[PDB]
Amino acid sequence: GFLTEVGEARQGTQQDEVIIAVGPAFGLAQTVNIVGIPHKSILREVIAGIEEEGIKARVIRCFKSSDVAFVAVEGNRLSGSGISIGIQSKGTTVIHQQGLPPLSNLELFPQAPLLTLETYRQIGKNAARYAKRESPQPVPTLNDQMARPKYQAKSAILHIKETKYVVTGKNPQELRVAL
Template identity: 35%
Template sequence: MSGTGERPAVLVYRHPGAPAAVVREVCAGVEEEGVPAEVVDAPDGLTATGLAHAAAQASRLEVGIGVDAAGATAVHHGKLPLDHPPATLGADAPAPDRRRIGRTGARVVKNLPLG
């Protein structure tokens, strides 16, 4: 994996084959809320939820986002069990939803309502 998670940021763990447009929209959503995002290349074999959970465990902010090879996306918090992500999004979601899930991750950091 590249990236260290040393600066406070929402870590975005992406599968090596994740669509660049999805990652770009997710990061834009995080940053729209005033929270930094750091993209990390993650190992193959994890679901979006697994990637998000791993990212949350590594993030100093305890929030991570995972993007799998197909473009499915999940937001997770480091204190939640693996099978309870706060938000998930299917691979076929439109760009505005991708940006929204990034904002959701940032809102988890800021303890704001997700709606």
């Protein structure tokens, strides 16, 4: 284990940051996404891509909901740039932004099994660009028709599991990483 909670997250005062928000069991009770990519290396590559574009990465844990859109919206709220990345334990990932309706977003990765470490890095990077108000090309659409046949039942099980750690009224916690 490598994510220590360092107290309630606060609103970012400079806009050279991107907030990464993970769900309540990310890196805790779950360790790996839905095809075994370890949470550690997901977070490592997402940060790296942000870091590469001259932007700061700030990581918090959300408790109030396990839905990836609501996890992200909590981060797009505390974020100095108003940009967040939301991530579920099973690996589903969204790039959100302040002012957007919760079930809207800038970019969505809705079939987690198709995400690689490369993809994740790309996601960090695209977020950072949006943070500096560019218009990066969307990360290319990944779509496989057998992803649901193969993994939806697993996805629903992993999500039920993560959904046990949901805590009503808890505000996000700021995390210190151990990459």
